[PDB]
Amino acid sequence: MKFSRDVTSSRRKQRKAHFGAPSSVRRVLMSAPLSKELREQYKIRSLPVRRDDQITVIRGSNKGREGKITSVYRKKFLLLIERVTREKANGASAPVGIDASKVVITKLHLDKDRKDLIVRKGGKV
Amino acid sequence: VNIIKKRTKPFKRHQSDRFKRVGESWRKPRGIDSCVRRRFRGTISMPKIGYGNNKKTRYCMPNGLKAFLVRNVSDVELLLMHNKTYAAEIAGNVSARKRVEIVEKARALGVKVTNAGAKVR
Amino acid sequence: ANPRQRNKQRSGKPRLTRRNANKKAKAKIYGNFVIQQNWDKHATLRQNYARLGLLATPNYVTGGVEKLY
Amino acid sequence: QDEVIWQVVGHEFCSYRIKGEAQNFCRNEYNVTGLCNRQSCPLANSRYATVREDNGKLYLYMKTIERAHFPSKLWQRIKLSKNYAKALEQIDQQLLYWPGRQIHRCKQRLTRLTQYLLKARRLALKHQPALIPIKPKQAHREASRERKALIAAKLEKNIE
Amino acid sequence: VRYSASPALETKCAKARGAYLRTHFKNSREVAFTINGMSLKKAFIFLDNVKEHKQAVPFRRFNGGVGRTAQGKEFGVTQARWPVKSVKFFYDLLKNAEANAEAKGLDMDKLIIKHVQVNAAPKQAYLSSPSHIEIIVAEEVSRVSLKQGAKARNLAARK
Amino acid sequence: IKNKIVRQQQYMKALHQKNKDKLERRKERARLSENIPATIESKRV
Amino acid sequence: RSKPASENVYLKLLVKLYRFLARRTDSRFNKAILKRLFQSKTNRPPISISKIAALTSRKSASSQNKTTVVVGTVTDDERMLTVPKLSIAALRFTKSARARILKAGGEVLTLDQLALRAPTGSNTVLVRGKKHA
Amino acid sequence: AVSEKAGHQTSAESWGTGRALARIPRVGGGGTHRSGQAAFGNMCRSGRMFAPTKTWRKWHVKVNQNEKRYAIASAVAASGVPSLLLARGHRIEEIPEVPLVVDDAVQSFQKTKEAVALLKEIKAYRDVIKVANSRKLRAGKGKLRNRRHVQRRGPLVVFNEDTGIVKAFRNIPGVEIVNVRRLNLLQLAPGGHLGRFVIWTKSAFGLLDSVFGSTTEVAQLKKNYFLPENIISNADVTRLINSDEIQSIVKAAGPSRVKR
RNA sequence: AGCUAAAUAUUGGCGAGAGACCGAUAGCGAACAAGUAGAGUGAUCGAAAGAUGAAAAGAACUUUGAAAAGAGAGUUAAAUAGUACGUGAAAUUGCUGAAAGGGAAGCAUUGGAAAUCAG
RNA sequence: UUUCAAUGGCCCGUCUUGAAACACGGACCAAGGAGUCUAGCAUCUAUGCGAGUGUUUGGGUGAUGAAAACCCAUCCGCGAA
RNA sequence: UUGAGAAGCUCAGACGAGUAGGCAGGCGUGGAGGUUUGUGACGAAGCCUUGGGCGUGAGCCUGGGUCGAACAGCCUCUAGU
RNA sequence: AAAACUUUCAGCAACGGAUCUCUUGGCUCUCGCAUCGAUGAAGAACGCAGCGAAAUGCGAUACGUAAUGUGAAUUG
């Protein structure tokens, strides 16, 4: 149970805060688990998703597909992964968005900031 | 002691046929001039305690058993000793899987089921 | 519901949210260092004064006092 | 003790009573007759006996005042033999000097329980059609599929 | 869209409909009632005659204010009118229903108007009465008792 | 549009704009060998 | 009336006992106790320990070991300093009345204890409180 | 309560008599669909409710401190009766003893696994399993109002000193931990129903005499308080009726249900 | 002639946490373009209006039509979800089926016939 | 269930009067829609205590929701003349 | 003889219009605490139905259809019932 | 006396938008804090985006500039 008067348990407030979140806040909201191998290598359970990360879809009709993230659609909380598309009637392909929590990061797009972020969260690189 | 019914027709509310806004559920006429309230000639009947049925056969189905609403198998086992007195009636919101478990267990206990064939076939 | 509250409901500028309210949090001791080192933040000031050997008030208490034992 | 307990459970509230149209039923695991009352409530009656199922073996459960304070050891259990006559003899010798009303309820339960075991074995031997469930989502979908399948089949032109 | 009638299956039938049509519902109902059950080509001739005033549409249900004409004697009534806008809509729908049947591969010569119905569209104080119209054109144990059977056996043996 | 009357009005303007432009190209155009109606049977695996 | 308006389970148990005694014995005492059990609080005025003491040792006295019985509360009387030895059966004893009777005197009984000691109510003084309010 | 101005913010008066209109006030002006519409009435749309709720409704109820202490004493005594716990709905069928008292090492627990392990050892974990399996979504508008989930009640842990017992037990679903000095009726008779399963520590049990006292000695922790006395000495009326003293004086019992 | 903290008040201001409250004719007039559209010379007055789907995958393509649309087709778990979009009551309307009908009708009682249920 | 036959069956509410009839309301359906909250007094019943009785102005206290629960110093109210 | 939900069981007799008024017991709805090892995408709620059943009645249960996310019995609490 | 018409019942389709579920809203309570303006406020008007009408933001540096934080978007 929550014991802090600074956090609200109200459903109305929590749903307003979730769907009213700015992009900097949705960046945290769109987090994915690190794979077992990455977890034992970096000592980090989960990370925010970033473009060009290598992920595997874990849930849904696309369970098992893998690919890089071609776009994080923060305004809809969606990940557009390459080759995970849908064929429209006319023959064009509409990419299918996957929630960040339904994928798992198999390889990270490491930068100086990501390494700094990793060691910041009690991690090792 | 056969099941005897003092009446089979329901008691429809006065003028409920003429008007759709007037439901068929019985309502006591309060008008001090209501001819049916005064029980005039040819008027429809009104519910009376004399219409009540024999206490021995009251609440009993034509087969002679009383209906007992059952939601899961546990309620079925509750009717182990009253299978000659009570018939299991499976609830409408009980899913198909639990119905087959209820019906099969009722068959073992020798308990009649009023709607055994529903959502089970 | 006010015009001034409807003004920022439909606005894009975020509310000036401050997080300061945590009840049951008693004021921490500044002032005396010896009292601060021996003050347990959970207890009440009457419990703390009595444990330390001090009188919270030199006058009668206006109510029943706790009897734990 | 017992009288006050009955006044609390039998007339305020009990989590074993299914209020019925003309009778209440005791969901208690020990009510011999199945309907709760002063003569049937295990809660209200300290000295109680019952007959119940256990993996094909009927068992006699008994409790008394001397064990009422210890729920773990309150009930005691013995096996009833397959033979009906010997089973009644065991019940009589176990419930000796117990009220004849209490023994009568136990023997009534044992008779019913024996009928239950006989019918269960008979239905186990006998073959019956298995009753499958019905899926509303499947039924609605397959219906729409067949309406579209028939409209696209063109049976008359194909036969002609 | 699902229609009111059991037919319009692929077997022998075709469909056509028009919704929110800016015509009078009362006149459309009279036209639909008149042309119902006719052969498709015969209905086209009748509709053309109505445009030319060689035939009339009987106003059976909605007959308030309709003058008497001798052209209604064919349908056994005296009150008949010549709604032109409603005939235009029904002519168009019959053209469309014919085209749908042609694409399907039906036999045009045996086509009858199996089902034609008019419904009120949402009202659109001069709230008009638009009409929904849909047209479907289609090609045209007991036992015996002991005494009963024994008598039957005795009777059969005597024969 | 979270306003139901407005989202309906924009859709009707969108529908008219789409239908008008679809037949603007249709009348300009007026093929059968390539463009054929695809069916479930043609899409069978 | 034939049942008490009180929903107290222990009072209902007392009524259950005295229903049996009234119809299975010939004691007008048991019939009286049952009727007074059905009475409301207003019609069961409290009786003082002083009035019990007065009535027992009244006129010819002759109280001996006869038990005083009241269907109601027995209140204390701080006015009298000396308390006689008494045996009273009552619905309720106030904490002061019970202490004074026990410490300096005899016994306090519940109405079920009386039913075991005097099931027919023999050698009992069935007293009542003043209903003048 | 509702707004004290809701239903009044419009301007409207009755159009009068003799105009073939119900004489309810109607909204003045024109050019909007509200114009001419009725207002100021329980029967009217966008009108005032009948007797608008007020915040000075009586919410809190006084109870004499003696009756509250009576009910809390009655709640504890009911907790010591095994049959009332079963009717309450507690899975105490394998509890070694009622009242269940554990040693004082429990008050110094630190981990939820230590508290769960103890519950299993005394076989009180069946009541926890019942609570976890009972968690359902609330039916009705309650879940729109921060009342999202419902569940049964587990055991009540009563301690004397808090050296980690409260935090060790507090995440176990259904378990409520309370100081023996401030026993709560809302937790001792939840729903108004007697007989909650209580687990006492040794120190909490040993101080119960100071908290409540006896029927003849004052409570140490409640000044001038004595445990209430009973209307009856013996609660087994059936034994009293069938006792030797009464069965030896009652006249011969007439027949039970007689023949017609 | 003069000043003065604290305990006290607070339908506003900047925030926060709650509720045995209301649930779209309710709750603020306003859950959505709400003091908006609109009305009045003006002071003022002042609404109606929430819900496709998990995803727009929002129906390519062919055909008819001047077009709007229709019909095959397609997407979908589902179009008994096609934006006139969750569920879809009644009033009311059209259609088909069955039956009744010589200046009212509804209803009650008893049965017959036809249809349909327990069986 | 529909329908037929025989038999019976005056339109509901409101108001007026000894009583009717007038007269007023009623095109139809859905949703809404009227003895409520509070202060005082009185009766009766229940509950607690009882020559007493009333914790909640306030204080203490409450780590797990702390607006709860729990505790009560001095007064005061009513009663006991 | 098992027939002690003592608030239960059983036997017997008489009686049955009813305005004002008085008294009693029940049905239903929103929400709250408790409980039912409660129901539910293998279909909750709702709706529809010349399906069935129960109650003198208020009402309740159920089959079939439609439907797509929650709801109910029991004991008490509460009311914008 | 068949049809039409009228009515009744059932089915289907309309019309309508009740019901049910929901809910970034309202309402009520409690708690913390004290901050408009001649250094031009509140309010009004007009403007500003690659493609914008409202609402939002902003003011010719015009859906923003600097600075700091985050660390890779925006999205029709």
XYZ file of N, CA and C (backbone and C1' of nucleotides) in Angstrom, chain J:
567
model
P -51.325 -16.612 -23.634
O -51.195 -16.254 -25.176
C -49.941 -15.877 -25.719
C -49.882 -16.158 -27.196
C -51.132 -15.804 -27.979
O -51.213 -14.426 -28.285
C -50.404 -17.962 -28.593
P -52.577 -13.624 -28.029
O -53.330 -13.716 -29.426
C -52.670 -13.357 -30.628
C -53.209 -14.128 -31.805
C -54.715 -14.084 -31.997
O -55.154 -12.902 -32.640
C -53.957 -16.312 -32.200
P -56.516 -12.191 -32.179
O -57.657 -13.158 -32.720
C -57.847 -13.350 -34.112
C -58.680 -14.574 -34.393
C -60.072 -14.588 -33.788
O -61.012 -13.826 -34.523
C -59.024 -16.656 -33.375
P -62.247 -13.132 -33.770
O -63.359 -14.270 -33.733
C -63.793 -14.908 -34.925
C -64.480 -16.215 -34.629
C -65.634 -16.151 -33.642
O -66.842 -15.719 -34.240
C -64.211 -17.949 -33.073
P -67.893 -14.841 -33.404
O -68.692 -15.916 -32.547
C -69.366 -16.996 -33.174
C -69.713 -18.070 -32.176
C -70.442 -17.598 -30.929
O -71.835 -17.497 -31.131
C -68.638 -18.981 -30.306
P -72.619 -16.151 -30.755
O -73.087 -16.379 -29.251
C -73.967 -17.440 -28.913
C -73.795 -17.864 -27.476
C -73.877 -16.759 -26.438
O -75.202 -16.374 -26.127
C -72.005 -18.107 -25.986
P -75.554 -14.824 -25.911
O -75.013 -14.509 -24.450
C -75.536 -15.190 -23.323
C -74.631 -15.061 -22.126
C -74.291 -13.650 -21.688
O -75.324 -13.021 -20.957
C -72.326 -14.938 -21.729
P -75.708 -11.495 -21.271
O -74.610 -10.649 -20.488
C -74.628 -10.579 -19.072
C -73.251 -10.365 -18.493
C -72.670 -8.968 -18.615
O -73.190 -8.064 -17.658
C -71.021 -10.562 -19.173
P -73.410 -6.521 -18.043
O -71.935 -5.954 -18.216
C -71.032 -5.938 -17.125
C -69.656 -5.510 -17.558
C -69.579 -4.192 -18.304
O -69.613 -3.076 -17.436
C -68.300 -5.810 -19.442
P -70.735 -1.944 -17.616
O -70.275 -1.171 -18.924
C -68.932 -0.724 -19.063
C -68.856 0.498 -19.937
C -67.985 1.620 -19.393
O -67.431 2.347 -20.486
C -70.222 2.366 -19.548
P -66.621 1.571 -21.638
O -65.527 2.626 -22.098
C -65.378 3.854 -21.402
C -64.082 3.912 -20.637
C -64.232 3.895 -19.121
O -63.064 3.315 -18.544
C -63.270 5.940 -19.790
P -63.067 2.788 -17.024
O -61.616 3.167 -16.493
C -61.459 3.953 -15.325
C -60.165 4.724 -15.348
C -60.010 5.779 -14.268
O -59.613 5.241 -13.023
C -59.408 6.704 -16.351
P -60.340 5.723 -11.677
O -59.641 7.111 -11.339
C -58.251 7.166 -11.069
C -57.662 8.520 -11.370
C -58.191 9.689 -10.562
O -57.670 9.742 -9.248
C -58.030 10.313 -12.829
P -58.610 10.194 -8.027
O -58.843 11.747 -8.276
C -57.749 12.646 -8.302
C -58.165 14.026 -8.744
C -59.290 14.675 -7.962
O -58.860 15.220 -6.728
C -59.642 14.997 -10.277
P -59.832 15.190 -5.451
O -60.951 16.268 -5.794
C -60.614 17.633 -5.982
C -61.742 18.397 -6.624
C -63.078 18.346 -5.907
O -63.151 19.236 -4.810
C -63.408 17.969 -8.211
P -63.998 18.837 -3.506
O -65.505 19.117 -3.929
C -65.915 20.420 -4.313
C -67.250 20.403 -5.013
C -68.383 19.703 -4.285
O -68.955 20.494 -3.259
C -68.375 19.050 -6.557
P -68.921 19.980 -1.737
O -70.273 19.156 -1.578
C -71.527 19.820 -1.604
C -72.552 19.051 -2.398
C -73.124 17.809 -1.736
O -74.138 18.109 -0.791
C -72.566 17.329 -3.987
P -73.984 17.652 0.742
O -73.830 16.070 0.656
C -73.995 15.252 1.806
C -74.610 13.928 1.437
C -74.214 13.391 0.073
O -72.955 12.745 0.063
C -76.550 13.303 0.274
P -71.899 13.097 -1.095
O -72.522 12.417 -2.393
C -72.881 11.045 -2.378
C -73.863 10.702 -3.467
C -73.395 10.913 -4.893
O -72.524 9.888 -5.335
C -75.632 11.666 -4.653
P -71.209 10.253 -6.180
O -71.524 9.677 -7.629
C -71.560 10.532 -8.759
C -72.916 10.519 -9.415
C -72.975 11.103 -10.814
O -72.560 10.171 -11.797
C -74.772 11.942 -9.516
P -71.135 10.333 -12.519
O -71.470 11.237 -13.781
C -72.645 10.996 -14.537
C -73.320 12.279 -14.937
C -72.424 13.326 -15.569
O -72.169 13.056 -16.935
C -73.839 14.344 -13.965
P -71.011 13.845 -17.713
O -71.679 15.250 -18.036
C -70.874 16.385 -18.283
C -71.388 17.600 -17.558
C -70.401 18.744 -17.451
O -70.351 19.525 -18.632
C -71.421 18.374 -15.345
P -69.039 19.516 -19.558
O -68.371 20.930 -19.270
C -68.656 21.625 -18.066
C -67.419 21.819 -17.234
C -66.180 21.067 -17.671
O -65.594 21.501 -18.898
C -66.408 20.814 -15.370
P -64.471 22.642 -18.990
O -63.182 21.998 -18.318
C -62.304 22.821 -17.574
C -61.355 22.034 -16.715
C -60.363 21.145 -17.430
O -59.306 21.873 -18.022
C -61.225 20.022 -15.542
P -58.663 21.364 -19.398
O -57.759 20.136 -18.951
C -56.718 20.313 -18.004
C -56.089 19.000 -17.625
C -55.862 18.021 -18.759
O -54.727 18.325 -19.548
C -56.820 16.885 -16.936
P -54.794 18.140 -21.138
O -54.782 16.561 -21.336
C -53.683 15.786 -20.889
C -53.948 14.310 -21.028
C -54.412 13.830 -22.390
O -53.352 13.700 -23.320
C -55.721 12.821 -20.703
P -53.081 14.846 -24.411
O -53.301 14.111 -25.802
C -54.465 13.341 -26.054
C -54.196 12.295 -27.103
C -53.050 11.345 -26.795
O -53.458 10.259 -25.987
C -52.780 12.216 -28.969
P -52.561 9.781 -24.746
O -51.378 8.965 -25.419
C -51.643 7.796 -26.172
C -50.433 7.370 -26.959
C -49.158 7.173 -26.163
O -49.112 5.949 -25.455
C -48.678 8.427 -28.090
P -48.691 5.948 -23.908
O -47.133 5.639 -23.935
C -46.630 4.512 -24.632
C -45.210 4.720 -25.088
C -44.208 5.104 -24.017
O -43.786 4.000 -23.239
C -43.893 6.469 -25.910
P -43.508 4.175 -21.672
O -41.965 4.555 -21.598
C -40.994 3.798 -22.306
C -39.755 4.608 -22.585
C -39.132 5.310 -21.390
O -38.326 4.450 -20.605
C -39.273 6.814 -23.202
P -38.403 4.510 -19.004
O -37.548 5.792 -18.616
C -36.132 5.780 -18.701
C -35.568 7.173 -18.626
C -35.937 7.980 -17.392
O -35.173 7.654 -16.246
C -36.306 9.295 -19.295
P -35.874 7.607 -14.803
O -35.996 9.134 -14.381
C -34.846 9.958 -14.282
C -35.216 11.416 -14.292
C -36.115 11.884 -13.161
O -35.394 12.141 -11.969
C -36.929 12.719 -15.211
P -35.985 11.715 -10.541
O -37.321 12.566 -10.402
C -37.283 13.965 -10.177
C -38.662 14.563 -10.271
C -39.694 14.027 -9.290
O -39.665 14.704 -8.045
C -40.604 14.068 -11.482
P -38.721 14.227 -6.841
O -39.248 15.068 -5.598
C -39.871 14.441 -4.491
C -41.127 15.165 -4.090
C -42.208 14.288 -3.480
O -42.056 14.150 -2.082
C -43.131 15.579 -5.231
P -41.786 12.714 -1.432
O -41.796 12.997 0.136
C -41.136 14.138 0.674
C -41.336 14.271 2.166
C -41.633 12.978 2.929
O -41.009 13.033 4.208
C -43.338 14.543 3.335
P -39.662 12.217 4.492
O -38.752 12.559 3.236
C -37.382 12.209 3.210
C -36.543 13.364 2.739
C -35.728 14.071 3.804
O -34.542 13.374 4.133
C -36.806 15.670 2.445
P -34.322 12.781 5.605
O -33.221 13.742 6.236
C -31.974 13.936 5.585
C -31.489 15.357 5.712
C -31.408 15.919 7.121
O -30.240 15.518 7.810
C -32.465 17.488 5.709
P -30.307 15.136 9.367
O -30.433 16.537 10.104
C -29.429 17.526 9.953
C -29.917 18.885 10.380
C -30.503 18.981 11.777
O -29.516 19.042 12.789
C -31.908 20.110 10.258
P -29.786 18.376 14.222
O -30.444 19.551 15.063
C -29.788 20.800 15.197
C -30.725 21.862 15.706
C -31.629 21.451 16.855
O -30.984 21.441 18.115
C -32.922 22.526 15.227
P -31.319 20.276 19.166
O -32.729 20.706 19.765
C -32.906 22.003 20.306
C -34.360 22.349 20.497
C -35.193 21.372 21.299
O -34.956 21.448 22.691
C -36.414 22.094 19.414
P -35.027 20.118 23.586
O -36.587 19.834 23.715
C -37.457 20.827 24.229
C -38.901 20.496 23.965
C -39.354 19.105 24.358
O -39.547 18.943 25.749
C -40.208 19.625 22.228
P -39.207 17.534 26.435
O -40.465 16.629 26.071
C -41.781 17.083 26.336
C -42.814 16.250 25.622
C -42.664 14.747 25.748
O -43.105 14.239 26.992
C -43.115 15.296 23.505
P -42.393 12.943 27.613
O -43.094 11.733 26.855
C -44.508 11.638 26.826
C -44.996 10.677 25.774
C -44.433 9.271 25.816
O -45.001 8.479 26.843
C -44.531 10.033 23.577
P -44.082 7.473 27.693
O -43.869 6.235 26.717
C -44.979 5.516 26.208
C -44.606 4.719 24.986
C -43.409 3.796 25.132
O -43.713 2.582 25.789
C -43.208 5.018 23.129
P -42.594 1.859 26.682
O -41.600 1.225 25.614
C -42.033 0.201 24.734
C -40.994 -0.105 23.686
C -39.607 -0.445 24.197
O -39.484 -1.770 24.677
C -39.418 1.112 22.447
P -38.419 -2.100 25.831
O -37.015 -2.037 25.088
C -36.694 -2.958 24.060
C -35.461 -2.536 23.306
C -34.189 -2.423 24.124
O -33.571 -3.675 24.343
C -34.418 -0.513 22.755
P -32.834 -3.985 25.734
O -31.469 -3.182 25.628
C -30.579 -3.403 24.546
C -29.473 -2.386 24.541
C -28.843 -2.099 25.889
O -27.922 -3.089 26.296
C -29.292 -0.064 24.796
P -27.783 -3.449 27.850
O -26.750 -2.371 28.389
C -25.503 -2.178 27.743
C -24.887 -0.862 28.135
C -24.868 -0.558 29.619
O -23.839 -1.234 30.316
C -25.616 1.339 28.448
P -24.176 -2.009 31.678
O -24.293 -0.848 32.758
C -23.129 -0.226 33.272
C -23.372 1.216 33.637
C -24.070 1.475 34.955
O -23.237 1.307 36.084
C -25.016 2.849 33.310
P -23.806 0.533 37.368
O -24.782 1.583 38.055
C -24.334 2.886 38.385
C -25.487 3.833 38.598
C -26.417 3.505 39.750
O -25.903 3.967 40.985
C -27.679 4.069 37.820
P -26.374 3.310 42.369
O -27.385 4.377 42.983
C -26.950 5.349 43.930
C -26.521 6.632 43.261
C -26.092 7.756 44.202
O -25.051 8.507 43.584
C -27.865 8.502 42.853
P -23.547 7.946 43.567
O -23.528 6.919 42.348
C -23.266 7.351 41.022
C -24.536 7.494 40.222
C -24.352 7.758 38.738
O -24.118 6.574 37.999
C -25.907 9.296 39.613
P -22.868 6.471 36.999
O -23.408 7.122 35.655
C -24.696 6.808 35.152
C -25.193 7.901 34.246
C -24.177 8.413 33.240
O -24.099 7.600 32.084
C -25.200 10.242 34.334
P -22.689 7.348 31.365
O -22.533 8.597 30.400
C -23.575 8.966 29.516
C -23.353 10.343 28.952
C -21.916 10.723 28.660
O -21.422 10.161 27.463
C -22.994 12.509 29.757
P -19.970 9.480 27.435
O -19.007 10.587 28.053
C -18.563 11.696 27.286
C -17.060 11.817 27.320
C -16.436 12.657 26.216
O -16.429 14.041 26.523
C -15.305 10.585 26.373
P -17.351 15.078 25.711
O -16.726 15.102 24.246
C -15.469 15.710 23.989
C -15.023 15.457 22.574
C -15.933 15.999 21.481
O -15.634 17.350 21.181
C -15.315 13.750 20.999
P -16.753 18.497 21.243
O -15.891 19.822 21.408
C -16.396 21.087 21.016
C -15.658 22.212 21.696
C -14.140 22.150 21.653
O -13.593 22.602 20.431
C -14.843 22.668 23.844
P -12.342 21.843 19.774
O -11.321 21.642 20.979
C -10.428 22.671 21.371
C -9.787 22.370 22.702
C -8.666 21.342 22.707
O -7.416 21.878 22.312
C -10.177 20.845 24.439
P -6.387 21.003 21.444
O -5.678 20.048 22.500
C -4.918 20.579 23.571
C -4.754 19.581 24.689
C -4.003 18.304 24.359
O -2.600 18.468 24.312
C -5.943 17.764 25.566
P -1.751 17.760 23.148
O -1.638 16.243 23.613
C -1.133 15.909 24.895
C -1.555 14.525 25.322
C -1.107 13.382 24.432
O 0.242 13.013 24.640
C -3.376 13.090 25.015
P 1.223 12.693 23.426
O 0.502 11.483 22.685
C 0.489 10.174 23.280
C -0.504 9.281 22.579
C -0.223 9.006 21.113
O 0.726 7.950 20.980
C -2.513 9.533 21.401
P 1.554 7.766 19.615
O 0.464 7.206 18.600
C -0.098 5.896 18.773
C -1.219 5.690 17.788
C -0.842 5.863 16.326
O -0.340 4.641 15.798
C -2.793 7.107 16.786
P 1.225 4.456 15.497
O 1.466 5.329 14.192
C 0.818 5.007 12.968
C 1.744 5.165 11.790
C 1.821 3.950 10.871
O 2.045 4.376 9.526
C 3.957 4.390 11.784
P 0.820 4.864 8.602
O 0.592 3.667 7.578
C 1.416 2.517 7.612
C 0.621 1.266 7.363
C -0.881 1.369 7.562
O -1.537 1.920 6.434
C -0.074 -0.552 8.664
P -3.129 2.150 6.418
O -3.273 3.731 6.425
C -3.387 4.444 7.650
C -4.624 5.302 7.675
C -5.928 4.591 7.339
O -7.010 5.210 8.033
C -5.418 6.204 5.654
P -7.038 5.250 9.639
O -6.013 6.412 10.004
C -6.222 7.262 11.113
C -5.845 8.688 10.812
C -5.230 8.938 9.437
O -5.562 10.260 9.012
C -3.721 9.601 11.098
P -7.029 10.623 8.476
O -7.913 10.784 9.793
C -7.740 11.882 10.683
C -9.053 12.564 10.985
C -10.271 11.643 11.072
O -11.181 12.138 12.052
C -10.633 13.268 9.406
P -11.145 11.594 13.558
O -11.502 10.056 13.419
C -12.710 9.643 12.807
C -12.669 8.174 12.491
C -12.630 7.247 13.696
O -13.918 6.980 14.223
C -10.914 6.648 12.208
P -14.172 7.013 15.803
O -13.247 5.851 16.372
C -13.470 4.489 16.042
C -12.305 3.637 16.476
C -11.911 3.759 17.938
O -12.696 2.951 18.795
C -9.988 3.978 16.598
P -13.276 3.557 20.162
O -12.022 3.598 21.131
C -11.247 2.440 21.375
C -9.892 2.792 21.930
C -9.881 3.745 23.110
O -10.198 3.116 24.335
C -8.256 4.423 21.550
P -11.138 3.858 25.402
O -10.140 4.796 26.204
C -9.009 4.261 26.868
C -8.041 5.350 27.251
C -8.607 6.463 28.117
O -8.617 6.121 29.491
C -7.369 7.393 26.327
P -9.822 6.587 30.443
O -9.566 8.139 30.660
C -8.329 8.610 31.180
C -8.306 10.114 31.299
C -9.477 10.730 32.064
O -9.009 11.851 32.808
C -9.356 11.678 29.917
P -9.050 11.832 34.411
O -8.675 13.322 34.815
C -7.337 13.671 35.122
C -7.117 15.157 35.024
C -8.242 16.039 35.535
O -8.235 16.175 36.948
C -7.491 16.843 33.447
P -9.610 16.332 37.765
O -10.063 17.828 37.482
C -9.202 18.918 37.766
C -9.624 20.155 37.020
C -11.061 20.589 37.222
O -11.260 21.276 38.442
C -10.540 20.668 34.927
P -12.726 21.346 39.086
O -13.429 22.535 38.297
C -14.795 22.453 37.930
C -15.049 23.086 36.587
C -16.506 23.154 36.161
O -17.202 24.244 36.734
C -15.221 22.297 34.385
P -18.577 23.995 37.518
O -19.680 23.990 36.374
C -19.655 24.945 35.326
C -20.237 24.377 34.057
C -21.583 23.690 34.200
O -22.669 24.596 34.218
C -20.137 22.312 32.955
P -24.001 24.221 35.026
O -24.763 23.220 34.053
C -25.064 23.599 32.720
C -25.767 22.495 31.977
C -26.877 21.790 32.733
O -28.090 22.516 32.729
C -25.492 20.185 31.708
P -28.928 22.680 34.085
O -29.695 21.297 34.227
C -30.583 20.855 33.214
C -30.778 19.364 33.267
C -31.211 18.786 34.599
O -32.577 18.983 34.906
C -29.465 17.484 33.743
P -33.000 19.298 36.423
O -32.809 17.908 37.176
C -33.531 16.756 36.774
C -33.008 15.507 37.437
C -32.982 15.504 38.954
O -34.249 15.274 39.541
C -30.945 14.650 38.139
P -34.655 16.040 40.892
O -33.809 15.307 42.023
C -34.006 13.929 42.299
C -32.884 13.361 43.130
C -32.627 14.044 44.460
O -33.534 13.656 45.476
C -30.585 13.758 43.341
P -33.944 14.693 46.634
O -35.058 15.615 45.965
C -34.707 16.831 45.312
C -35.513 17.999 45.824
C -34.921 19.375 45.522
O -35.978 20.330 45.435
C -35.078 19.097 47.842
